[PDB]
Symmetry: C2
Subunit: 336 residues, 2 copies
Amino acid sequence: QVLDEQLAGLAKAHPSLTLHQDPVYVTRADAPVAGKVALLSGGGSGHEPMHCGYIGQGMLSGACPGEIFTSPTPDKIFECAMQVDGGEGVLLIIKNYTGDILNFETATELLHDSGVKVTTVVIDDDVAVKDSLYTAGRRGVANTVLIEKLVGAAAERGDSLDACAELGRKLNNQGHSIGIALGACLADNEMEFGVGIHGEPGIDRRPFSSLDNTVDEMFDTLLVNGSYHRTLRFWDYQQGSWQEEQQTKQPLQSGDRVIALVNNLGATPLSELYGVYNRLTTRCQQAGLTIERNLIGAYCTSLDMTGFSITLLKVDDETLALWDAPVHTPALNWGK
Amino acid sequence: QVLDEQLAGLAKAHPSLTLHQDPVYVTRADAPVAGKVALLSGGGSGHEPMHCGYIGQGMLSGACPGEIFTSPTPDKIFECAMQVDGGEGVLLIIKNYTGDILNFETATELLHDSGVKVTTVVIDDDVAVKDSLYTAGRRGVANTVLIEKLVGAAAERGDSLDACAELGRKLNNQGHSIGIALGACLADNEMEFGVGIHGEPGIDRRPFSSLDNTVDEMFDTLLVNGSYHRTLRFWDYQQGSWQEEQQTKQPLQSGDRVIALVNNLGATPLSELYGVYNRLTTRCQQAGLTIERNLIGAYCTSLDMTGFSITLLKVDDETLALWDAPVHTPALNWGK
């Protein structure tokens, strides 16, 4: 089994991780870490390094990979949460797709039913399409990575479960993303504009004119599609029930400070990602947006799809301190 | 110019780097760093993050990008070396290609003539083909990155130019690489076995059967093509002339301890690189090689080429201490 080989390789490459069997999931080798909120996510394989490459100090306590483009089953999520539970609650970060919501939600009830204090954060940052093929609402994409790092820092320093969940939900309302593909994981000199990470169709198919013109269209879309009101359920562990919470996003606007993530969906050369970043800085400055930090590289992929995405997350001084806090994972490492 | 936009993006993204103009090159923002040997390299654009992503403490003091797949001209190299010179000499790391050798050797003499103490290290780790399209001898590839890090740590530690140079030439004799491409940056389910990073032909074209079988073939080639005797010229700064030096490589052998670099040439999904690493660990273990450290990711690319390379570098306790030493660059970051 290739997936089995790939996971064994990740485990052999990183002594800081433990690969479990029956069922399969990955955790920090030092989990459970007593006294800290434990953070978990998971999803289909085919988006590496999301999420296994984000397991470590300052970030995920563990992750549950599923088959290609498919959510892990609830037993994987449950056993992973039980393995990392440090007695202070487990926070599950779930990307907004039909399968992920159903499995993580089922795992959440089984955990609660077993005495574990748990709650959830749903990520729906992709501004391109509402109600795509596998999603009720907006798709969860690359901002998931920024949220895991920020909430990961909050949990690592000792914040409460409620404080980490509140932070995750707030960041979710403040992060906006859009991706384009020039080829699948076609048309010829055409791109799928607003493509999804499982290959879902975008807003439309259009002609690729230039890299700069493409960034302009992506950026303009992030500005005009920012406003959004919808319901996201979360687990209320006190009542033992799902809570339907109306959530609101404001569009990005002049005066906002952001963290920018220019993300390779798979086969985009790093040189091109820098050209993308260059044009993005110009557009942000014209629009009155201040980029305070950036991440440029392959952080949330779609197999070998040829394309990239842009994510802009509004932040403040407190959030920027959580960004700068230490993180030690396979994909992200700083002691800043 | 797209190339101009990319370097501007790199500069905007990393305040720790300074992009110079007239001529163009990049240095650490804090260069010249007084009292330490300065380390420099360069080469064609299209291999990002090599070499600009390796500029920083514990690694390169600066780098000189050229046009796509083309060596930087001598003026860039000379001006960059003058900018980073910390009073202890500048060490030039040069990959073995006709253009790089010519232009870096020319800069070396101009430097010497202007009073800068300089010497050189030539990299020829590709075991696949002798005398390819743009190389006299063996091609310089991914081991260049491992050498930059190791000699980078030594320079940062305060070793002399001679010491850094001798270490670089020693590592060069102990590091072995090979790459394959499934597609350029061509046939149906065929691979170019022993491909060059500029797209130079390999040993042959052959059918891709499986990931594990491809790794087996690449690994076997590293084991059997290891033996190598050749002349590599280096600048003797005391005599002010090029010294022809016979250099010898021993094949990798049972009992050797190694650092493994599994490197994306362009569009290989990270999940697959982990599959590669899984198979590589098995083969090393069977052959009596102990992998002590690894790097898995996009470190020395070829535009968007579809393929990957494997590098094995023999090391000892002292070299491992230089590996573990701190490094702070865009592409590689770890602390004590």
